[PDB]
Amino acid sequence: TYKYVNLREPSMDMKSVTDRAAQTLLWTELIRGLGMTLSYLFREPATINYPFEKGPLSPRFRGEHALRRYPSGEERCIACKLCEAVCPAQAITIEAEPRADGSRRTTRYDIDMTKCIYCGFCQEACPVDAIVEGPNFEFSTETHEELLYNKEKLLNNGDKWEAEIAANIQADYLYR
Amino acid sequence: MWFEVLPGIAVMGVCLFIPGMATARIHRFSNGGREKRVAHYSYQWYLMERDRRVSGVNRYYVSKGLENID
Amino acid sequence: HPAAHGVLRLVMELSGEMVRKCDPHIGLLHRGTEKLIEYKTYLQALPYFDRLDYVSMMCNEQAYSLAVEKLLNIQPPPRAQWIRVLFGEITRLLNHIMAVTTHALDIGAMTPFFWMFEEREKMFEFYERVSGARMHAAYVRPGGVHQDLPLGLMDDIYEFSKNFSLRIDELEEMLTNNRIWRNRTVDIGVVTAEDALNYGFSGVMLRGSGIQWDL
Amino acid sequence: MFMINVLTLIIPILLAVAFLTLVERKVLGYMQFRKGPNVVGPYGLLQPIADAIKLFIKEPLRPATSSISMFILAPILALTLALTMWIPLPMPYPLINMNLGVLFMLAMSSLAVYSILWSGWASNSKYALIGALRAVAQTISYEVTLAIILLSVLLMNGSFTLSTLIITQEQVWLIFPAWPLAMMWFISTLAETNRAPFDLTEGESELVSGFNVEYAAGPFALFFMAEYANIIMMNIFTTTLFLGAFHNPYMPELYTINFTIKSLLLSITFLWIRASYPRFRYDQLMHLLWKNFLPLTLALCMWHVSLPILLSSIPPQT
Amino acid sequence: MMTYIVFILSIIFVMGFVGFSSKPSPIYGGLGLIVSGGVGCGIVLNFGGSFLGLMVFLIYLGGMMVVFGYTTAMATEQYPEVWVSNKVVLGTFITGLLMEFLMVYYVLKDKEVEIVFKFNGMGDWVIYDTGDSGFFSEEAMGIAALYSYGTWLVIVTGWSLLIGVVVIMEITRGN
Amino acid sequence: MNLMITLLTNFTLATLLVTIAFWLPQLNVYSEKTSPYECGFDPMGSARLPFSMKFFLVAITFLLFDLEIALLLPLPWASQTTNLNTMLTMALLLIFLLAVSLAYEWTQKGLEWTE
Amino acid sequence: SRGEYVVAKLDDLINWARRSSLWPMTFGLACCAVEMMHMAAPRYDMDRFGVVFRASPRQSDVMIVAGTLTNKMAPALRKVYDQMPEPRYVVSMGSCANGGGYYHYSYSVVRGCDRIVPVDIYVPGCPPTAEALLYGILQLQKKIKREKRLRIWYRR
Amino acid sequence: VAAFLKNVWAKEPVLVASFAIAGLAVILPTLSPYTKYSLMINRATPYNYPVPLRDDGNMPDVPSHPQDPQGPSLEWLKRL
Amino acid sequence: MELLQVLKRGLQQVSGHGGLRGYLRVLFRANDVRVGTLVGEDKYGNKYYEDNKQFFGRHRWVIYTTEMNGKNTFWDVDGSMVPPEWHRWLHCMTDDP
Ligand SMILES: CCCCCCCCCCCCCCCCCC(=O)OC[C@H](COP(=O)([O-])OCC[N+](C)(C)C)OC(=O)CCCCCCCCCCCCCCCCC
Ligand SMILES: CCCCCCCCCCCCCCCCCC(=O)OC[C@H](COP(=O)(O)OCCN)OC(=O)CCCCCCCCCCCCCCCCC
Ligand SMILES: CCCCCCCCCCCCCCCCCC(=O)OC[C@H](COP(=O)(O)OCCN)OC(=O)CCCCCCCCCCCCCCCCC
Ligand SMILES: CCCCCCCCCCCCCCCCCC(=O)OC[C@H](COP(=O)(O)OCCN)OC(=O)CCCCCCCCCCCCCCCCC
Ligand SMILES: CCCCCCCCCCCCCCCCCC(=O)OC[C@H](COP(=O)(O)OCCN)OC(=O)CCCCCCCCCCCCCCCCC
């Protein structure tokens, strides 16, 4: 259940001693390292040509957040506050009130992207599949306050990436 | 692939081809179509000075042949 | 400093170049984790362990999950245990590639870094396929694992584990037989067995000193 | 007219240094399973231009605790010595045909160390002092063995003139009868220019940058082009010493092409060595040349001084 | 004024000697001695001894580099004096340069000077020889005759160097 | 004539590349940028303190050895003399004395570093 | 005017030289430095774009704050940013270097690196992937490209 | 002495090679028969002018013309 | 032998981009001149190509348009200029365009 790494005893005979002396005076293993670098010179490099050649991903990828809708126009969230209660970094702030038709809908839904750790607790604690973690990751901003998403930005992101979010959910909903 | 290191290296080749041959061309221009004569020892310098004095133009590469004598 | 692992302040008293005293000042990355863990629930403090050892994520996840399951008097299903062990060994490959390649980089061999970071990227792709995030997976939870494997992952792991032996062979051809690599490591940092035991050393520090001990 | 000759000598070597930066980056990338710069232009031909224009529009950053006069004099001396020591090399006709060009190159290679030393001492920093003292240790490690190697390999040439070295190798290469001296000379040229695995002065692992850690852009580029011109000159010097090509007095372009491709292969071998080996410790390099190279160099010097007398093969001095 | 090239080089030689003999700090003393060795090898190279000049240049560069390593190691100060940080050093440097240029002005006026010997004012190009030297330089054959003729000199010099190595071993021992 | 012209040309080309690097760009100097760099923290002590060296013995050995091999440099020209046996004997004696001195340094632990 | 065209072309040239020769500094703190090294991996290959790490701040162009900037580290980061020569850019990457991330309410964590150093590009994520960091680097290059230094100097 | 030679060849081959090269370089020129060839090759090289002698009347060994058969010839050097 | 086959493949890569002008355009815009099957084109002008003979990660690529939402994007290409329906296929998240 164990092996004696680096305990081999070197030989003593004249041929092996002459071989070791020849390797000492002629630097054989340095030539071996040179040959390995020369072998790596003639391979196909694994470099992709960004931004024309994106790296492979998965349908389960966690990126920018978005708010979904039912397939009739109604927003999915009913302000149950499970996501802000399960968010470990407290990035989600929710304030709700009954709207004109008496439906339990949000009034403030803020996600601080600089607080968010992108772990998908909100997208897995949502009972109505409202909040999702979309596949977008190219959304870096030049200003700090642009990473403070309110409800309007999240709804616009959902309307922008619904055609991909629906397909990803249809792909991955049977594992949940 | 690997052969794309061959363009830039080739530029290096041009960057190592320009100077030295240029000196040879310079040595073929000032010295009248011959090599620039070397003077490692004082006998060669004395022959250089004798040639410069005997040319009559104060240029040592102006070679005067056997038609000069009677 | 490129030599220090990110944040580390060695105040070193030197006799010219030979070290006479080393004082490692730390705390430049003290985030105060184990108070905010007390200020959060168990599931909320589960992603805290992904960032302690940021090259051994699912190992720390498995440690925290084993502690919570021991306190809860429950056990995970066998398939979850096998998934956890397989991904722990993948994580061990990640950490050991990181250790050997970075150590050779500070010694001076910068080429096996680029040789093995491709395999590191492939294991990160496996992480992303199984959890959705490349490093901080938050995959291993008390009670098993969060989600099952996507189909076709086992074959990709099989192909990668088929070629990784040749990758290790290339690395060992590069570094082990080299005389310059030996001259920096043959008689540097010799630690006896008793001094390793009394200093709280664990893992390879014991196993490099002849002490037969594996958890 | 000599102004034209000296400018056509010194401008293409600067262009060669810049394209050597390009070739170094791209070849070193390709040996590490990746690609070099190819986005700046067509196959990255404009990367050295971007680097050179970028470095000469940045701030110089002269420190307050540094002696400014030596801080300015040291990179000037480095670039100057890198420039006026390319001259005695025959290409196939040298610009300056010195009778004692070998000793001239030895003396000006000994002089170029002082630029590193005064750069380390002038900028008041501990890492710069460590780099300067490591340069001192490297010099006392390599210099005597380098000089004895050159003396032992010049016993077959006849004299110290670099122009007559082509005539010596007109029949056969000088690497055939002096290959141990050739290997020891190659290691000496590697350790002379502070190239890997004997960097030890611009050590980015043990130190941050070494002697040029306080040198910001503008003066920092001077050390870079001095080092790269130095490695090209060592490659050309080794090619002339041990790989003498066929010279036709009517067609010097044949010799120019031959030693150009040979020096290119030698620089490729330099970068081949750079990517594959860990860095030596600077006390192990000190015991490398003084214990392994030096006794063999002394024995080979006695062998090469007793050989031509033994064989009636003493070369002429004219 | 190109005929006085050796005289100008000798002026720079005494200038460097004044520069490092005022003893400001051994770094700048080493720099001054490097400059002095360079112009001295230029002088002797102008007289025809190129080998001797190159040899003394190489030897003194190596010696000054070992010296600089020693002063960085051992002979150092918190605030080294460049040339003007000390009043006495700057003063004696100024009077050394003033005396040198006064001697230059006096010898460049009547072409004669009396400092304890008697010296002319013409350039040294007059004292050269007018004939050639054949196919050899005299200095090269002269130093090459060290082994064919100077056996006693070689023996005593090799013994002195070996004894010097033994002496260096014995002195820096401590017990 | 040509050597000083080449020296002056190279010196001028070197010294022009710093005054171009100085007077061209926009400079902004404050009393925090030009501090000595010690990895983000201010250093302890000065850089002019005594830097205790270890290889002083090998430095003195190099001081002797540089010129003691510079005695061996006219050995090419010494092969052109008529008296050859004496030259060969003296050269072999010189390099033998060099080898004896090196072996005496090696055996007495002189090449090892202090502390 | 011809002078306006001349200063516009010179501004374009210097912006091209500065944006195609970015020299970041080897400076990481945490997880996001591991992702930065994965951006330096052969797959993404930052050295294609002229991006090459430099150890010293005096020979560096940009600084990438990758990790958590704690209270004990902030003077060191400020001095390191101060020692960099102009022009200098800072790319803030990761949630820790943006707004504190997981450790926003911790006692010894600076809530974002904006409080210490001026920031050009904010890269969100935990960690933001090597593709995302390369996208942020390209966005910084685009920001450098549309600089108007010599045009404003001619107008002023 | 075979055991000592094998041990020192296994431990430090560089010193063994250096001592063997040194021993050959010391003891070999005294064995080769070509050292006198070097001697007369070095003595036969005309650095200086061969200043003639006055013909007193009895000098049978020196010639009057360089093409005369009397004198030191170098057909051996042309042959070698 | 196989060298002139490499030369023929290079000449075919030159000819497959619409001639020399298209070759230099795609070289100076994308830094990669390998041809591929035209899988698709969106409403903004971006072209999407696939070549499954290349290794994984290089088998799908996009040539961006020169005009997107009123902006001259001849040189300043962006990774966020891909519509989501093609962003699924480009990032290897599915096998169906
Ligand atoms: C110019 C032409 C090309 C030259 C080669 C260039 C390409 C190859 C480059 C390879 C990579 C080099 C990277 C740097 C390596 C640095 C380390 C290094 O060089 O260490 C040297 C090492 C040093 O050894 P070491 O560092 O292992 O030290 C061993 C120390 N002990 C023993 C105490 C453990 O080897 C040498 O010094 C050998 C020098 C060359 C020897 C040549 C011998 C020729 C044959 C002689 C005769 C033999 C037969 C016996 C006598 C017969 C008589 C008739
Ligand atoms: C010893 C040999 C040394 C060799 C050194 C040089 C090696 C490389 C040689 C050149 C190789 C090709 C370089 C091509 C650069 C890019 C050219 C280009 O496309 O520029 C486009 C750019 C913007 O133009 P835009 O208005 O957008 O175009 C509309 C398009 N529908 O427009 C511009 O940028 C403006 C035009 C720029 C043209 C630059 C041309 C190359 C200059 C290289 C400098 C050195 C030249 C040679 C010097 C030595 C010989 C004299
Ligand atoms: C403050 C810091 C320093 C600032 C200034 C730095 C200036 C540059 C410093 C680096 C260069 C130092 C050069 C030192 C002298 C080198 C001499 C040399 O290169 O000689 C080569 C050659 C010898 O060959 P030879 O055998 O004489 O051939 C004659 C037969 N054809 O010679 C010839 O062929 C003869 C050619 C003419 C020689 C004229 C006489 C010598 C000129 C010396 C100039 C001044 C050198 C000052 C060195 C200062 C070093 C710090
Ligand atoms: C007469 C011949 C010519 C002699 C004069 C010319 C010499 C040319 C070469 C010069 C060499 C200079 C340096 C010599 C140093 C010898 C002393 C020495 O250092 O011995 C130590 C070594 C054992 O190593 P260690 O003690 O560990 O060393 C410390 C760090 N390595 O100890 C050893 O390894 C043992 C060394 C002594 C035994 C060597 C045997 C070599 C045999 C070669 C084949 C036969 C040659 C016959 C000629 C006579 C040889 C004596
Ligand atoms: C009165 C008329 C004259 C007025 C004075 C002005 C004289 C000329 C000044 C220099 C040239 C100005 C124009 C510079 C380029 C402007 C256009 C530009 O920015 O093109 C961008 C293009 C690369 O586009 P990019 O955004 O990188 O594309 C993404 C890739 N997928 O870029 C390219 O394709 C490459 C651009 C190359 C630019 C030319 C080459 C560099 C400069 C060489 C000459 C100067 C330096 C000489 C050598 C100095 C020492 C090394």
Ligand code: SF4
């Ligand atoms: S992904 Fe996690 S950290 Fe981010 S908002 Fe959702 S629950 Fe909070």
Ligand code: SF4
């Ligand atoms: S968990 Fe879902 S339904 Fe509940 S408040 Fe959050 S987004 Fe709305």
Ligand code: SF4
């Ligand atoms: S943002 Fe996340 S990945 Fe980056 S350093 Fe902070 S905890 Fe680690």
